[PDB]
Amino acid sequence: MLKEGAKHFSGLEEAVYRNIQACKELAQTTRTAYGPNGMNKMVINHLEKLFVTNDAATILRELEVQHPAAKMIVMASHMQEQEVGDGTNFVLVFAGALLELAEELLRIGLSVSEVIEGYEIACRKAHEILPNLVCCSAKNLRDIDEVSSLLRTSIMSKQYGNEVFLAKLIAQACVSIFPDSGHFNVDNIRVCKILGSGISSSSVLHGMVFKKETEGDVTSVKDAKIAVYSCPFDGMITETKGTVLIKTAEELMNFSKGEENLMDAQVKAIADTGANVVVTGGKVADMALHYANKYNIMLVRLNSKWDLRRLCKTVGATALPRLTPPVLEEMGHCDSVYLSEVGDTQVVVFKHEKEDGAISTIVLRGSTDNLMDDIERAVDDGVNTFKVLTRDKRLVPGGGATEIELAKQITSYGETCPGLEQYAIKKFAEAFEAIPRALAENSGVKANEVISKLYAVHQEGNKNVGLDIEAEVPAVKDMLEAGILDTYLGKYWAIKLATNAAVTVLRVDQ
Amino acid sequence: NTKRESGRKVQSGNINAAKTIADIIRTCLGPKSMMKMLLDPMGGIVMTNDGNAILREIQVQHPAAKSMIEISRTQDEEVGDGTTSVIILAGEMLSVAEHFLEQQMHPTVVISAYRKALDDMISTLKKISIPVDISDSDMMLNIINSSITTKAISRWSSLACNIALDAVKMVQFEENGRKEIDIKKYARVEKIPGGIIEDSCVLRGVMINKDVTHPRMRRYIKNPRIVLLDSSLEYKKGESQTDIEITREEDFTRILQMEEEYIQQLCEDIIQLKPDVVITEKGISDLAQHYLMRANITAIRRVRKTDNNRIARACGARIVSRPEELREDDVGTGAGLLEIKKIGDEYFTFITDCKDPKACTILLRGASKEILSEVERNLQDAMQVCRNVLLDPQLVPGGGASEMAVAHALTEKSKAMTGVEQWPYRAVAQALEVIPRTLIQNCGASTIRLLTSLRAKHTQENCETWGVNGETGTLVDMKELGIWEPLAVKLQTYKTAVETAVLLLRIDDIVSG
Amino acid sequence: MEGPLSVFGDRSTGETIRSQNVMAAASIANIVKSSLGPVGLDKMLVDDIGDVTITNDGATILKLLEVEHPAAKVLCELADLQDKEVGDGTTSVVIIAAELLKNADELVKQKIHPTSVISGYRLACKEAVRYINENLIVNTDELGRDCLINAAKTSMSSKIIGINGDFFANMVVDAVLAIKYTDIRGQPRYPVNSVNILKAHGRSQMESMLISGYALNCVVGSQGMPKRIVNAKIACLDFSLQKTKMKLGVQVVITDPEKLDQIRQRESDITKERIQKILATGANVILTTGGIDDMCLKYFVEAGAMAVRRVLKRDLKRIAKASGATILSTLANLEGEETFEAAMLGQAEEVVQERICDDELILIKNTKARTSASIILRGANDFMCDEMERSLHDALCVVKRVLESKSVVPGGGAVEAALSIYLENYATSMGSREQLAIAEFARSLLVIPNTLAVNAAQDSTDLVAKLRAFHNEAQVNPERKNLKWIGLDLSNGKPRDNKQAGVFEPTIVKVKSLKFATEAAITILRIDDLIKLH
């Protein structure tokens, strides 16, 4: 500070200005990233690996910032995308415009604790009409059209075009078989994409898809107990050293000769352990194969952890490197163990399915994985909004159409309550139009055009916009009545989480 | 030539010069004031609550710094006051409106919000303006003494108003009391250098300082004969041209004395008859006028025919070409008081012309000739509010609560208007409320919570009538508090205010030629 | 002025000066764009330092800017010349010229004969020019429901200052009917402002009052001398009766002021003598231009005499022209003993003095030599009469201008917004150079309406969405009607619903300005070889 000491990241500009920078600075791309969008935002890794996300996190978790608040608020966006799903971009984009209001209240010079409460009581006042803005609920998981609609706004507010087809797919993923009564498998149903075919050819499979190549004669039974091992056959090459390296140079050679008898007795023990599918993260080899052909066990030639862990998870298995003949602590959890060729590619298909504990593994297909990876992002939007764990989700109009419902009132309620308080309440309800503006300016029309119409249409829950021509001029799309809705829960956490950080980050002078 | 000028840069400098000029002047405004002290490039300091006095005496610049004094002077002449309002009002509206609205990117809807805000402003004013008696100088006093205390001076609040109160009522027009239009040649003020406020009083009529300038002239002869030129003293004063010689150097001295020797005969035919008054609009030369002063014929000159015509009938007269030629007879005396006061060696002829258009040049004095001026500067604004109470008996209370009274009334029309125009019409609204806020932030504490209490007060209690106190900041009644913002003076500042900002809107571009 | 620093005088050869000129045309034409149209913002422009002017008119701006560049020079003087044609299209002809001089010059380089590219900007002009007169499609004042009457009401309703325009629907058609002057060269053109139009407020602002014959507004209240005797005749007088100095035989040569007092004395009587010489001539109403001093007037008024002094001359002349009176007949001077004859007497059914709305005029009823009419406005205040007056002016000229040349265009660049793809297809089938130039000409049309709407903040993408989405190749037809709205109303920026509106231009300046728009382009072509005087 004034002194040799005091290493400080915030205060003065930093507090006043520079926090609001990374607030609005990061809130930039989420303006494009929530609500109906195609927006191409090209993200590559430290691998510099091409990708585009319409969800903030892959932009967010990609990024690097010395601003802890901006580094924090994502955890609320996390807490969104953790508890919830699409609407994660909404988290950041809301607060940033709301936060500028406080700094302009600091351009007014308004006291922190005084601006603090104005967002909060108004939030619970927004949370007051938020259930009042519950219009419908999500009636039946068993109803595809309920879940498609559930998936629609989900995929839409990331990707508007692919919306309903996917929304019909993952609704007909029949994840409804998970009652959402307090059980739904999120990972056990996880997508396994197929590079190749179409993304319209992208479908849902039930039972665990494993795109990795079947080896050995396919499983002797189905319900075949599942030996999931990190390297049961990597070859007989040594697993045995603490650093997994050479001790003396003579050990690697013996692994060629007794390989047969090992890869006999080993997968013989796989036949002996009861596993008719042994999953080898290490390499498939002929002797294993040849003997797993004699023993008719399906080898799973090579494994991602995502393969292994899921098999470690879903099967209850433990993936372990093996040379000696192994045993099953693993067995199966799976009552049908398949090699199927899906996407035309050989696909290991494990299946056990229950109202609670099913695996319905969506098989995406498509010419590019840089398609399906962002598609999965757009798809996981609804996979999330599936899990609310109120089957009837108390849908409020999605797409921010029920904003102006709150927006008009809380800000009219704004002047109702008094003082430096009332401004932050008024400011609170002024941050609604941001997302529609952000969206309508993704379709390229200002709020005031759009929003004065949303002000003109008054109490609807219906009107909002942001990718369409009806987005442009009319300020009328149905983000309610057209099949776009959103659960109270997400919309709660949409308001709730966007409420929390914005206030809490306001304190820091360091 | 290849030149073009782009967009915001002028508009910024407009908004820049707009608000900056507004800053100190709006803090110089109000019961709690400030001072704008210039420091001349020479080292002389100039401290005035009026930046119009400061800016004209310092650098005046091509942007609205050029356009602020014009509309200030436009606000200077008409009513006589609001001088500090327009630049703090125009600097007020343009900033808050444009940028946000030019961030919404449009000139046009911004232009309309002015005329939008104009009527609601007219509306809630004319509504919540309070009619005050035209014929009661006391009911005039509380409204008229409020407009004196406005700028730098409460000193002449009682005195200037008192001198202003009855005079303006006692004025008339060509179209008729005074009332109606703004004519300030019926508001006239001529100084009495030195003197005292006790020697001063209300002169409801006109004085001619040049009527009697000497004890020799007609004095206190109360049936006047005022004479317009044409025979006794003719239109032509030209040379006699007797025995002129172009070949003589002595004739050069002769031709200049010969001008007045014919004028000598002109004022001599005044002597041959002696109509007790003589007026000449081209003025009389001295050598002839000495003879006028021998005949006790008051010599009126360097004050206009229209002036004298308005004074003659109002003091009474029969005009003739020459008294031996009577065109027709008029009334002998039109006034009740013919008074010549002497302060210094100068004689000041005060002819009270009662219920007369006249020139209404009103007797006023300070202790010295300088504070004598602050009688007039207040008298003007006093006579302004005198003519205003005559013009508009209805005039608002406010501490600037009118500037809220409109803004929320704007807002509640703005809420009713909606459209995109809602935002400009509201972006014009919140501008108005910084003016009284600066008055009551000069007071202190939270002037927002005040405006909260204000806009609470607005529809709750009242808008402008039950107001905010410029010396306090609490919610009060400016009528009860006796503070008054004159309706005309209010609206007039705004008519002048709205336009310059529209010009600054219109101008993204200038030239050097 | 970019290019080399060694040589100068518009000498780069090169395209440097040429690009400079398309830049030199730009900035000059750029100034007009924000001034383009009435919605063009008034531009405060500093002529020296304190010398400053606020102008949204291109031509007036073009007057201010001293042109070192010929590009600047060929754009200014020509829009200054189109301003001296009419002045409709000043801001128009400027803008398109910025593109077309790059369109005019460029392809002449590419040859296909040197002369070809130029007529392409002339032919597409004539194409449009032929299309111009073809347009009643929007703004029909060549015909209409009331035609010119509702065209007034509509051109009122366009500029309308109130719920009025109804009484002002008729006033404008009176303006062509009240003026019978039938302008020279066989034109039945009637100047709209040549009518006696005497602005007098009072009562309902909505009201206005036509007068049988031309009306003469005379001063009221400063004449106690009777202006009122119901008569068949006025004495139209350019003439004066003064008590003070009618003539001087006594000068400052005379040392005594008394000797003029005596000639000052006689002149007061001959005024009484003069006014009863006209009464002896038989006119119990006279229209006098003269007057006296206020002191004299105060005495002379209360003395009494028959005169109407200081009559408006433009009315006096027209009425004397209308009634048959002369402003001068037997009077060679101002003397009050001069005899008066009947040649200065007006011939009409009656001279009757009607004071209504606190307003009295000398009303010459049915002036016999020629039909005459004068519309007395009624405002709530004086500005209201001016308020309603300018809204008439839309209605006024447009009634007059369609009489100048028949039909019109739909105003604004919407009329050309259809012509663009018309003339780019009229380019397209031509091919070769003739697809190039002819399309270059039609594409350059389209900046006007946007920048028109831009000045009104209805802008560009909005208007091109508005314009040639309406405009079609499916309907290319001017028709008489709208299967496309090709009109653009500007106080607005957007095409509107008023198809009699006087805020759409007539057919006149259009055929002109396009040639001038083609002109400023082809104008700069002309230099042969190149040199530097050094």
Short mmCIF file of N, CA and C in Angstrom, two decimals, chain C residues 333-371:
data_model
loop_
_atom_site.label_atom_id
_atom_site.label_comp_id
_atom_site.label_asym_id
_atom_site.label_seq_id
_atom_site.Cartn_x
_atom_site.Cartn_y
_atom_site.Cartn_z
N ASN C 333 -46.69 64.13 -56.87
CA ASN C 333 -45.95 64.45 -55.66
C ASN C 333 -46.83 64.14 -54.45
N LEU C 334 -46.35 64.54 -53.28
CA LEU C 334 -47.04 64.27 -52.02
C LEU C 334 -47.91 65.43 -51.56
N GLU C 335 -47.99 66.51 -52.33
CA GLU C 335 -48.68 67.72 -51.90
C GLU C 335 -50.16 67.46 -51.63
N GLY C 336 -50.69 68.14 -50.61
CA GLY C 336 -52.06 68.00 -50.16
C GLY C 336 -53.08 68.83 -50.90
N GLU C 337 -52.64 69.77 -51.73
CA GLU C 337 -53.55 70.55 -52.57
C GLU C 337 -53.77 69.89 -53.93
N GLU C 338 -53.05 68.81 -54.21
CA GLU C 338 -53.16 68.13 -55.49
C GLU C 338 -54.55 67.53 -55.67
N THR C 339 -55.10 67.73 -56.86
CA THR C 339 -56.38 67.15 -57.24
C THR C 339 -56.24 65.63 -57.33
N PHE C 340 -57.37 64.94 -57.17
CA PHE C 340 -57.40 63.48 -57.21
C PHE C 340 -58.46 63.02 -58.20
N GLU C 341 -58.10 62.04 -59.02
CA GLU C 341 -58.99 61.50 -60.03
C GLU C 341 -59.36 60.07 -59.68
N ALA C 342 -60.21 59.47 -60.51
CA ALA C 342 -60.81 58.18 -60.22
C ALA C 342 -59.98 56.99 -60.68
N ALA C 343 -58.86 57.22 -61.37
CA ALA C 343 -58.04 56.12 -61.85
C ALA C 343 -57.39 55.33 -60.72
N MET C 344 -57.29 55.92 -59.52
CA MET C 344 -56.80 55.23 -58.34
C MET C 344 -57.92 54.53 -57.58
N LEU C 345 -59.13 54.51 -58.13
CA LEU C 345 -60.25 53.90 -57.43
C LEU C 345 -60.42 52.44 -57.83
N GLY C 346 -60.57 51.58 -56.81
CA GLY C 346 -60.75 50.17 -57.03
C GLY C 346 -62.17 49.81 -57.44
N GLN C 347 -62.27 48.85 -58.35
CA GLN C 347 -63.55 48.40 -58.87
C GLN C 347 -63.86 47.02 -58.31
N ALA C 348 -64.87 46.96 -57.45
CA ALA C 348 -65.33 45.72 -56.85
C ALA C 348 -66.78 45.91 -56.42
N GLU C 349 -67.44 44.80 -56.11
CA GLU C 349 -68.83 44.85 -55.66
C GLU C 349 -69.01 45.84 -54.53
N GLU C 350 -68.23 45.68 -53.46
CA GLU C 350 -68.26 46.63 -52.36
C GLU C 350 -66.89 46.68 -51.71
N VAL C 351 -66.55 47.86 -51.21
CA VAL C 351 -65.48 48.02 -50.25
C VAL C 351 -66.16 48.06 -48.89
N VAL C 352 -65.97 47.02 -48.10
CA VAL C 352 -66.62 46.91 -46.81
C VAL C 352 -65.57 46.51 -45.79
N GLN C 353 -65.61 47.19 -44.65
CA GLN C 353 -64.62 47.02 -43.59
C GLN C 353 -65.20 46.04 -42.57
N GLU C 354 -64.62 44.85 -42.50
CA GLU C 354 -65.07 43.81 -41.59
C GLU C 354 -64.01 43.56 -40.52
N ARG C 355 -64.38 43.82 -39.27
CA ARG C 355 -63.54 43.51 -38.13
C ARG C 355 -64.11 42.27 -37.46
N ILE C 356 -63.38 41.16 -37.55
CA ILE C 356 -63.75 39.92 -36.89
C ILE C 356 -62.48 39.35 -36.27
N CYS C 357 -62.63 38.64 -35.15
CA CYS C 357 -61.51 38.14 -34.36
C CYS C 357 -60.59 39.26 -33.87
N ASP C 358 -61.16 40.43 -33.54
CA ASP C 358 -60.40 41.63 -33.18
C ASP C 358 -59.47 42.08 -34.31
N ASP C 359 -59.83 41.74 -35.54
CA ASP C 359 -58.97 41.99 -36.69
C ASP C 359 -59.80 42.60 -37.81
N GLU C 360 -59.48 43.84 -38.16
CA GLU C 360 -60.13 44.51 -39.28
C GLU C 360 -59.16 44.69 -40.43
N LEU C 361 -59.62 44.35 -41.62
CA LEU C 361 -58.89 44.58 -42.85
C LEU C 361 -59.81 45.33 -43.80
N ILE C 362 -59.23 46.08 -44.72
CA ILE C 362 -60.00 46.67 -45.80
C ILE C 362 -60.24 45.56 -46.81
N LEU C 363 -61.50 45.18 -46.98
CA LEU C 363 -61.85 43.98 -47.73
C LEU C 363 -62.52 44.38 -49.03
N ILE C 364 -61.83 44.15 -50.13
CA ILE C 364 -62.31 44.56 -51.45
C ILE C 364 -63.02 43.33 -52.01
N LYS C 365 -64.34 43.40 -52.08
CA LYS C 365 -65.13 42.20 -52.31
C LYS C 365 -65.35 41.97 -53.79
N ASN C 366 -64.87 40.82 -54.27
CA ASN C 366 -64.90 40.47 -55.68
C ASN C 366 -64.27 41.56 -56.53
N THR C 367 -62.95 41.71 -56.42
CA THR C 367 -62.23 42.59 -57.33
C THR C 367 -62.50 42.17 -58.77
N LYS C 368 -62.96 43.13 -59.58
CA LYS C 368 -63.60 42.82 -60.85
C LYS C 368 -62.64 42.50 -61.99
N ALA C 369 -61.48 43.16 -62.07
CA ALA C 369 -60.56 42.90 -63.17
C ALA C 369 -60.12 41.44 -63.18
N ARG C 370 -59.86 40.87 -62.01
CA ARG C 370 -59.43 39.49 -61.92
C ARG C 370 -59.88 38.91 -60.59
N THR C 371 -60.24 37.63 -60.60
CA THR C 371 -60.65 36.96 -59.37
C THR C 371 -59.49 36.96 -58.38
#
